[PDB]
Amino acid sequence: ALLSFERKYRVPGGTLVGGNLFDFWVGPFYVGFFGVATFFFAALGIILIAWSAVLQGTWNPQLISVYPPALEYGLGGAPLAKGGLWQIITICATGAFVSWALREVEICRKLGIGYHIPFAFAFAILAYLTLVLFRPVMMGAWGYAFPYGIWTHLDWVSNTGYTYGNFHYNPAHMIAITFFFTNALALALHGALVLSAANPEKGKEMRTPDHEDTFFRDLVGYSIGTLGIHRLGLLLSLSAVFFSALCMIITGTIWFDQWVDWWQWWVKLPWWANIPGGING
Amino acid sequence: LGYTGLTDEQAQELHSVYMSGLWLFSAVAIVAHLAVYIWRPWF
Amino acid sequence: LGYTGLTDEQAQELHSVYMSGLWLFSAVAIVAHLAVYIWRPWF
Amino acid sequence: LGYTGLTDEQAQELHSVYMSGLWLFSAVAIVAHLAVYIWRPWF
Amino acid sequence: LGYTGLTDEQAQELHSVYMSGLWLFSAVAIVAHLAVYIWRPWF
Amino acid sequence: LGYTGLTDEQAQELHSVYMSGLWLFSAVAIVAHLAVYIWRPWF
Amino acid sequence: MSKFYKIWMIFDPRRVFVAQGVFLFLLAVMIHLILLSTPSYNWLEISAAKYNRV
Amino acid sequence: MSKFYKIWMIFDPRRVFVAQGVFLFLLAVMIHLILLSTPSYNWLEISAAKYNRV
Amino acid sequence: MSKFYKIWMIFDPRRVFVAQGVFLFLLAVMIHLILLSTPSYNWLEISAAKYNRV
Amino acid sequence: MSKFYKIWMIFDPRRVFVAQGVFLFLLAVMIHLILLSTPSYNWLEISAAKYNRV
Amino acid sequence: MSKFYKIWMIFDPRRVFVAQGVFLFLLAVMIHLILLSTPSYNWLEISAAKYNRV
Amino acid sequence: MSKFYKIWMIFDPRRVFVAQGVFLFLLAVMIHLILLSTPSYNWLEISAAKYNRV
Amino acid sequence: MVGVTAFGNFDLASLAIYSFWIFLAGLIYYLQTENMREGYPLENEDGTPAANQGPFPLPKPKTFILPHGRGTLTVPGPESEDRPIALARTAVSEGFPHAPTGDPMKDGVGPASWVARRDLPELDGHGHNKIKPMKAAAGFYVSAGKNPIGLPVRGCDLEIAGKVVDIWVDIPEQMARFLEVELKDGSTRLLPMQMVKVQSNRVHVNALSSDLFAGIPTIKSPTEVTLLEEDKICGYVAGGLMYAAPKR
Amino acid sequence: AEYQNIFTQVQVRGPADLGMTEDVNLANRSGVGPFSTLLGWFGNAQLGPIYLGSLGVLSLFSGLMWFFTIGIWFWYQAGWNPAVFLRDLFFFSLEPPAPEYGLSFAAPLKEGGLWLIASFFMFVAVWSWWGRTYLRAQALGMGKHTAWAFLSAIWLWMVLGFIRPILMGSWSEAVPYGIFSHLDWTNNFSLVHGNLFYNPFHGLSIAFLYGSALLFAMHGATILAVSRFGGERELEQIADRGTAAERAALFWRWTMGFNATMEGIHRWAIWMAVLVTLTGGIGILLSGTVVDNWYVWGQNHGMAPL
Numbered sequence A: 001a002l003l004s005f006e007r008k009y010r011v012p013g014g015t016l017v018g019g020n021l022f023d024f025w026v027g028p029f030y031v032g033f034f035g036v037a038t039f040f041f042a043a044l045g046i047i048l049i050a051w052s053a054v055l056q057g058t059w060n061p062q063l064i065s066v067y068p069p070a071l072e073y074g075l076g077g078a079p080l081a082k083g084g085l086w087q088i089i090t091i092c093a094t095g096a097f098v099s100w101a102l103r104e105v106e107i108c109r110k111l112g113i114g115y116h117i118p119f120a121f122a123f124a125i126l127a128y129l130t131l132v133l134f135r136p137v138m139m140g141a142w143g144y145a146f147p148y149g150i151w152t153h154l155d156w157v158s159n160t161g162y163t164y165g166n167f168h169y170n171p172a173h174m175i176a177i178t179f180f181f182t183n184a185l186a187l188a189l190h191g192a193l194v195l196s197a198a199n200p201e202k203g204k205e206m207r208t209p210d211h212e213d214t215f216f217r218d219l220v221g222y223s224i225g226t227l228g229i230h231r232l233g234l235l236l237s238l239s240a241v242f243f244s245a246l247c248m249i250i251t252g253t254i255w256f257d258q259w260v261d262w263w264q265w266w267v268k269l270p271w272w273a274n275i276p277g278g279i280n281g
Numbered sequence B, C, D, E, F: 001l002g003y004t005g006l007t008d009e010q011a012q013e014l015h016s017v018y019m020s021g022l023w024l025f026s027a028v029a030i031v032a033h034l035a036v037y038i039w040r041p042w043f
Numbered sequence G, H, I, J, K, L: 001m002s003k004f005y006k007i008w009m010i011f012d013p014r015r016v017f018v019a020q021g022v023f024l025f026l027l028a029v030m031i032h033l034i035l036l037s038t039p040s041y042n043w044l045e046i047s048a049a050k051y052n053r054v
Numbered sequence M: 001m002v003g004v005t006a007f008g009n010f011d012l013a014s015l016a017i018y019s020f021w022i023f024l025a026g027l028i029y030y031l032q033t034e035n036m037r038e039g040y041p042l043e044n045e046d047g048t049p050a051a052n053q054g055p056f057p058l059p060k061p062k063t064f065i066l067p068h069g070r071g072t073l074t075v076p077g078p079e080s081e082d083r084p085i086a087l088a089r090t091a092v093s094e095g096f097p098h099a100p101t102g103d104p105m106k107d108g109v110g111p112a113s114w115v116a117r118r119d120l121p122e123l124d125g126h127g128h129n130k131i132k133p134m135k136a137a138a139g140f141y142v143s144a145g146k147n148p149i150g151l152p153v154r155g156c157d158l159e160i161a162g163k164v165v166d167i168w169v170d171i172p173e174q175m176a177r178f179l180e181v182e183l184k185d186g187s188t189r190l191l192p193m194q195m196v197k198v199q200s201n202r203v204h205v206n207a208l209s210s211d212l213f214a215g216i217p218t219i220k221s222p223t224e225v226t227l228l229e230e231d232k233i234c235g236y237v238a239g240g241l242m243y244a245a246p247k248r
Numbered sequence N: 001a002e003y004q005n006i007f008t009q010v011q012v013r014g015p016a017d018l019g020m021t022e023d024v025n026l027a028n029r030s031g032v033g034p035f036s037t038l039l040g041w042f043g044n045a046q047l048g049p050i051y052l053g054s055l056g057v058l059s060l061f062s063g064l065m066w067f068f069t070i071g072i073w074f075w076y077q078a079g080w081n082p083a084v085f086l087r088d089l090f091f092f093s094l095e096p097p098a099p100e101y102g103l104s105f106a107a108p109l110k111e112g113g114l115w116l117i118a119s120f121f122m123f124v125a126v127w128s129w130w131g132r133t134y135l136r137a138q139a140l141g142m143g144k145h146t147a148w149a150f151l152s153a154i155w156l157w158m159v160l161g162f163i164r165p166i167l168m169g170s171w172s173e174a175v176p177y178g179i180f181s182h183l184d185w186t187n188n189f190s191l192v193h194g195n196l197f198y199n200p201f202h203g204l205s206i207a208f209l210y211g212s213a214l215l216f217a218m219h220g221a222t223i224l225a226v227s228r229f230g231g232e233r234e235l236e237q238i239a240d241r242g243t244a245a246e247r248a249a250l251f252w253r254w255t256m257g258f259n260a261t262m263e264g265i266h267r268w269a270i271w272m273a274v275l276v277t278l279t280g281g282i283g284i285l286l287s288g289t290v291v292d293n294w295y296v297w298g299q300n301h302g303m304a305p306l
């Protein structure tokens, strides 16, 4: 089945690999070469997660976990039961994510649109690799990565965040959090503004981009414009992920102590380092 | 007054049926309350 | 005036119905408060 | 009224079938409740 | 003339009814304050 | 000047009634201040 | 009370009915849960104690 | 105080009725909850203690 | 009581039917699980102990 | 002060009424809260201790 | 001191009245709170001590 | 000295007046709080100590 | 702390989490139905409605009132691609590409597709043309950045196709929407600015080869552009990424 | 290279747009401010006018009082030393009263009463600002969507500062007015209640924050990818669907198997954003008042090994 306007777009071309071997649609999905690759990797990863569940001895979805190898294996292999299944599933997950991005590239080419979406997805992929490849290798052990469990990977997060004190004092963490929070705020504002313009008070005429510009100038004395708001949303999300991967690439590689002591450098500035009075005086 | 499209005449039967339902509901509720209060009171 | 779009008569009758409901609610409130006060006064 | 765009006799027939199904459901419920109450009462 | 697009006579009537409401509310407040201060003074 | 352009009589009456209210408020405040100081002075 | 039917010239009957339904179901489940929380009104525990079921 | 009918020349009945319904329900629930919090007014516990339901 | 059929002049029957289905199913599952939680009314455990399957 | 009426010609009556209603509710609840917080005027505990309920 | 009235010709009456009301309310709340803050002036606690309340 | 009328031929009276009112209020509250900070100028503290309110 | 459980381990937090599961299911249902107001019902590749329509029913219609008497738009409703879509299905079975029968860049299919939008100009909140050329606008000037007027325009084959003459700007947005380009024949074609690389000495266009700017659709008026014309121009220009590709 | 439409390569400036007026009171409106070329490289370079009504001025005054009160207390903590004030600015704090005062207003000004005053100021400011957003939507005849989206964050804020302290019976529970003081409040809140990670509503709030980031990356990338077809003009694509809306729909139709519309994607967006603070407020409200150890609770509800 197709949407009422789909048929004029379902034309050949745009595929990076193949070109007619894997140029078709299964239901709504576009299957390409990378569609085949991503389906294989994802199916393997899911089946191996279930298999690791039966090896773990639990069928609670929230208790299933797939741990990486211990710190003793360094950056080497591991038996499937110890940390090998996690390494295979990391292979499958990386392959699936990359194949998904390249399949999106093919879809972009076939629709004649920009490649903003696969690029923005590559940002998330590189954050994932920062957590499972870059930081572990720069640290030297696959056991510094997180397990594949719903609540055990939060255990990884908590233990790592407390290995360095209160992680709130990481400054890259601070800018990443500010980006995340302002991105959520921007998304709320954008959704609300567009819905308010498209849906008027009651039984009256639809509003215009000038009307929403007017509303936000009457609210906060400014409006960024409909192209600017989408620019800002993409930038906020991508930069939040970038400084997230930044806060976790300098942590345990450049800074090793409690991050709070970082903020000492400012209070020990020689001009006012030794003034009596205040919080730290 | 007819903001909802009602014409003040079928609203009468609508209210009659709604009050019938409300009073049947309250009768069953009173039966349940009395049965529980006999079972054990709260005052 | 008349931002509600109601004439004087409609407003008066609507107010009469609303005051009937308000007095019913207030009477039930007085009854419940009296029962609670005689059972376990808060003063 | 007339929000749903249904005639009175169509609503009558639909309600008749629905009440048949409702009474069948409630009858099965009563039989099951009575059976368990005999098996293990909660009062 | 003004800002709200009202006259003086309707303004007088509205002021009268609002003042009646204000006096009633303030009188109930005074009675309550007397009752409480007799019950438990704060001076 | 004349951003509003209100006729001078209107501004005169507005200021007069505003100052009437202000004097009323300041008088009540003065009475309350005297009462507070007599009850428990800060000087 | 002889003019309460004008409530259907007040609000859309569908909206009032659905709000009433959700309101009443939420209240009913809340009250039943409150009673079940208190040991003195948990009829399951009471009936277990009376018949020495546990 | 018998000449208040003029309120409906100012305030829409639609707004006031729904807003006051929500207001009254929320205040009623809040007061009931405050009473439920204070141990002297938790009527469930008072009835449990008075009738040796422990 | 006789003219409850008028209900089908206010709501679309499909919406009511699907809402009733999901509401009834959720309520039935909730009550079955409540009974399962209480050891007094866990018929599985009653059959286990009554026939010494432990 | 016999001429306070014409202020209704300056401010919109609906604006004034809704603002003053919100203000009255907020002030009333704030004063009630202050009185509830202080042990001297918390009437629930007064009635608990005075009637020897606690 | 006989010429201030013409400020009502340079200031919108609605704006200035709202500003004055907001300012007076905020100032009054702040001062009442400061008085409640000082242990020598909190009338609730003063009357609690003088009348020997908890 | 007796020529300051020419500042208002360019400045807006409304903006100047509102800004100066806000600035004066902020300065006044800042100074009052400064005095309240120093125990040698905390008039509430001084009166509490003089009349033995603590 | 009210840590009391009504039954099992079901405390107030459990009540909250299950309530949120129910609410989330309802909200996802609502959000999905609100997103089925375009392109529905689904159709077979021959245009007839398909056997399957999805587990989600279509929502009730909603009416938008366009600001300037443009009419009331009700969605969902009947739909039709009221234009000659020129494609032939490569396979008898479903789910395979439809090959263009002719020149796809000219037929308006695939990445060159266009939508039969209203053939009326875009009206702002003041009731005026939202977009008008630089001259038509009163006071608008290049406030900052490169001024791309008189610059050569170089196609994807690296041969000049024309020179930029004017910029069409947006009145309520103050955004530079379109570049007007004159070819060898003295006629003007519009170019969306999202497709042009405005360098220091040229305005490059990677989408189109030099011998395709004349194939860009034209405009009935030289000062007002309608939504249909804008869509045709944009579709044609963006179709050159796939179709004008073989000529570098 | 190939242009990506992330920065405007050409800027254009015209008459100052004073905006529309459906029921707007023109009197409160300001006049257009300057124009920012740097900020115009990303969006509308125009600044102003600003509407200043009655709830608006109330909000401005109350927020000024709140921020200024915090500032004066910070100066007091500095010993009135400007150098210290610029040295210990992050480490300052207008802390709430200590727990032995409970909810009482009888706390010394230096011992949390000033916190009560500033909290009153901020409460009044934020609620008047919510009324302001609702009224500004009302004047232009627009829907009140921004008001409710704001109410979600307002509820999280009220739980953090007002509702939860009332329920816990002490102002000591509330968040201080400091930079690292409120960071420390956050970390200590997690530690006291036993790994807030196992709060299900904290997990839901994080799910919707991650989802907001994912959804705005997706939507921004989608609109920029179809901006060559006039995808930015979302309202007109709603009124008169173009090839931009169809290509955006078909990209996600072929990627994910389902898609949104030009209007319903913003319903997704607003709900994804407001669920963050809705679930967060619920989770903070349950913490302490209902659950004091979230990891033990998790153990009892699956979610963790026994």
Ligand code: BCL
Pocket (backbone or CB within 6 Å): A157, A181, A184, N126, N153, N154, N156, N157, N160, N185, N186, N187, N189, N190, N195, N196, N197, N201, N202, N205, N206, N207, N209, N276, N277, N279, N280, N281, N283, N284
């Ligand atoms: C060690 C610390 C704990 C932890 C302790 C807490 C605590 C405590 C809280 C959170 C909360 C949250 N946590 Mg946590 N959290 C942890 C780890 C994480 C991790 C992670 C990867 O480890 C992530 C992604 C998160 C993410 C989140 C968010 C989803 C959520 C915050 C919502 C929000 O945006 O509020 C930001 C928005 C507001 C707070 C409201 C602001 C809006 C109002 C109106 C402000 C008005 C502004 C005013 C008028 C003017 C402003 C001033 C001027 C700008 C100068 N947490 C660890 C386990 N977390 C919050 C929550 O609700 O979760 C249950 C919360 O309270």
Ligand SMILES: CC[C@H]1c2cc3[nH]c4c(c3C)C(=O)[C@H](C(=O)OC)c4c3nc(cc4[nH]c(cc(n2)[C@@H]1C)c(C(C)=O)c4C)[C@@H](C)[C@@H]3CCC(=O)OC/C=C(\C)CCC[C@H](C)CCC[C@H](C)CCCC(C)C
Pocket (backbone or CB within 6 Å): A038, A041, A042, A043, A044, A045, A046, A089, A092, A093, A096, A097, A100, A104, A117, A118, A120, A121, A123, A124, A147, A148, A149, A150, A151, A153, A237, A238, A241, N210, N213, N214, N215, N217, N218, N221, N255, N256
């Ligand atoms: C970079 C900015 C943000 C972002 C953007 C973004 N995400 C994207 C995209 C973009 C632009 C897409 O185009 C792509 C998409 O299709 O979206 C629907 C996608 C996507 N982002 C997704 C999820 C996602 N994004 C996240 C975050 C973010 N995405 C950033 C905040 C998160 C977080 C924070 O947790 C998640 C969970 C998917 C919905 C989708 C990509 C789907 C995909 O990869 O498809 C192929 C793979 C599968 C269908 C399944 C693979 C399964 C594995 C083989 C096994 C499991 C391995 C895994 C390690 C298990 C771990 C479990 C535990 C951690 C609990």
Ligand SMILES: CC[C@H]1c2cc3[nH]c4c(c3C)C(=O)[C@H](C(=O)OC)c4c3nc(cc4[nH]c(cc(n2)[C@@H]1C)c(C(C)=O)c4C)[C@@H](C)[C@@H]3CCC(=O)OC/C=C(\C)CCC[C@H](C)CCC[C@H](C)CCCC(C)C
Pocket (backbone or CB within 6 Å): A181, A182, A184, A185, A188, A189, A192, A219, A220, N050, N059, N060, N062, N063, N064, N066, N067, N122, N125, N126, N129, N130, N133, N146, N147, N149, N150, N151, N152, N153, N273, N274, N276, N277
């Ligand atoms: C859905 C949840 C997300 C969200 C949503 C959200 N936030 C919102 C909204 C929404 C929907 C609004 O509508 C509202 C708004 O107006 O946004 C612009 C707002 C808002 N969210 C804000 C902040 C904010 N949101 C946050 C978070 C979030 N908001 C969540 C992530 C956070 C965080 C992460 O902590 C912050 C800090 C504000 C920008 C704004 C509410 C502004 C407000 O209420 O202001 C009141 C004013 C004060 C208390 C202090 C004012 C300080 C000034 C210095 C006073 C003096 C001014 C001066 C006199 C001006 C002079 C001007 C002249 C020279 C012209």
Ligand SMILES: COC1=C(OC)C(=O)C(C/C=C(\C)CC/C=C(\C)CC/C=C(\C)CC/C=C(/C)CC/C=C(\C)CC/C=C(\C)CC/C=C(\C)CC/C=C(\C)CC/C=C(\C)CCC=C(C)C)=C(C)C1=O
Pocket (backbone or CB within 6 Å): A026, A029, A030, A031, A035, A036, A038, A039, A040, A042, N214, N215, N218, N219, N220, N222, N223, N245, N248, N249, N252, N255, N256, N257, N258, N259, N260, N261, N262, N265, N268
């Ligand atoms: C304004 O503009 C915009 C829009 O609109 C105009 C939009 O809309 C959107 C999009 C946004 C939304 C719709 C809002 C909602 C979105 C979110 C909340 C974001 C998160 C989304 C999700 C979690 C949804 C689910 C996502 C994923 C990744 C699931 C994807 C599904 C699969 C993995 C299936 C993939 C199938 C492939 C690749 C085919 C493989 C084929 C083969 C190997 C050969 C054939 C195989 C088979 C026959 C197997 C069986 C069939 C298949 C393939 C599938 C069915 C069976 C299964 C077992 C799965 C945006 C941003 C927008 O801004």
Ligand SMILES: COC(C)(C)C/C=C/C(C)=C/C=C/C(C)=C/C=C/C(C)=C/C=C/C=C(C)/C=C/C=C(\C)CC/C=C(\C)CCC=C(C)C
Pocket (backbone or CB within 6 Å): B010, B013, B014, B015, B017, B018, B019, B020, B021, B022, B025, D001, G017, G020, G024, G027, G030, G031, G034, H025, H028, H029, H032, H033, H036, I004, I006, I007, I009, I010
């Ligand atoms: C913490 O505090 C707690 C929660 C413990 C205690 C607090 C308790 C509180 C706040 C309780 C509040 C209770 C209230 C306000 C209860 C109100 C109940 C009411 C008004 C119930 C009304 C029910 C009405 C019913 C059930 C009517 C049913 C009608 C039918 C079933 C028939 C349907 C007929 C129709 C639709 C008419 C069709 C006719 C035509 C012509 C179309």
Ligand SMILES: COC(C)(C)C/C=C/C(C)=C/C=C/C(C)=C/C=C/C(C)=C/C=C/C=C(C)/C=C/C=C(\C)CC/C=C(\C)CCC=C(C)C
Pocket (backbone or CB within 6 Å): B001, C013, C014, C017, C018, C019, C020, C021, C022, C025, G003, G004, G005, G006, G007, G009, G010, H024, H030, H031, J025, J028, J029, J030, J032, J033
């Ligand atoms: C923190 O502070 C605490 C909570 C501790 C204490 C503070 C408490 C405070 C501040 C309490 C304030 C309480 C107040 C102000 C309560 C006011 C309650 C009122 C005014 C209730 C009014 C109820 C009126 C009702 C329910 C009237 C109902 C009327 C009807 C049902 C009649 C039906 C109407 C029809 C049919 C409309 C007629 C239409 C036409 C066209 C005739």
Ligand SMILES: COC(C)(C)C/C=C/C(C)=C/C=C/C(C)=C/C=C/C(C)=C/C=C/C=C(C)/C=C/C=C(\C)CC/C=C(\C)CCC=C(C)C
Pocket (backbone or CB within 6 Å): E010, E013, E014, E017, E018, E019, E020, E021, E022, E025, H004, H006, H007, H008, H009, H010, J017, J020, J027, J030, J031, J034, K025, K028, K029, K032, K033
């Ligand atoms: C922390 O500090 C604490 C709280 C301890 C101490 C602070 C205390 C403070 C700041 C107290 C402030 C008190 C103030 C300013 C109180 C002011 C109270 C007022 C002005 C109350 C006025 C009430 C007026 C009422 C109730 C009027 C009712 C009028 C009617 C019901 C008439 C209805 C007619 C209408 C609505 C229009 C229809 C008329 C026509 C002609 C259509």
Ligand SMILES: COC(C)(C)C/C=C/C(C)=C/C=C/C(C)=C/C=C/C(C)=C/C=C/C=C(C)/C=C/C=C(\C)CC/C=C(\C)CCC=C(C)C
Pocket (backbone or CB within 6 Å): F001, K003, K004, K005, K006, K007, K008, K009, K010, L024, L027, L030, L031, L034
């Ligand atoms: C930490 O540092 C401390 C605070 C300890 C020490 C620092 C102190 C500093 C820096 C102090 C700075 C002080 C300054 C700069 C003070 C300036 C004060 C001034 C210039 C005050 C002027 C006030 C003018 C007033 C109050 C005029 C009021 C006028 C009216 C109320 C009449 C209303 C106006 C009308 C009616 C105009 C009518 C005419 C027409 C055409 C309508």
Ligand SMILES: COC(C)(C)C/C=C/C(C)=C/C=C/C(C)=C/C=C/C(C)=C/C=C\C=C(C)\C=C\C=C(/C)CC/C=C(\C)CCC=C(C)C
Pocket (backbone or CB within 6 Å): J030, N067, N068, N070, N071, N072, N074, N075, N116, N117, N119, N120, N122, N123, N157, N158, N159, N160, N161, N162, N175, N176, N177, N178, N179, N182
């Ligand atoms: C040179 O500097 C000057 C003096 C000119 C001005 C500078 C000021 C500065 C540097 C200010 C710094 C301010 C900062 C850093 C503020 C930080 C604020 C933060 C991080 C706040 C975080 C959370 C705050 C929350 C959640 C507050 C919530 C408050 C409420 C929800 C309302 C509370 C309402 C209460 C407690 C009851 C109010 C009612 C009465 C009757 C008191």
Ligand SMILES: CCCCCCCCCCCCO[C@@H]1O[C@H](CO)[C@@H](O[C@H]2O[C@H](CO)[C@@H](O)[C@H](O)[C@H]2O)[C@H](O)[C@H]1O
Pocket (backbone or CB within 6 Å): I026, I027, I029, I030, I033, I034, I036, I037, M007, M008, M009, M010, M018, M021, M022, N300, N301, N302
């Ligand atoms: C998910 C959306 C639909 C929700 C279901 C519809 C009904 C909504 C209310 C149902 C709430 C009851 O749901 C039921 O709660 C009981 C409370 O002990 C849980 O309890 C059960 O598991 C827990 C956790 O492992 C055990 O500690 C406990 O001994 C056992 O009784 C059930 O696992 C759960 O299924």
Ligand SMILES: [Fe+3]
Pocket (backbone or CB within 6 Å): A190, A194, A230, N219, N223, N234, N266
């Ligand atoms: Fe958008």
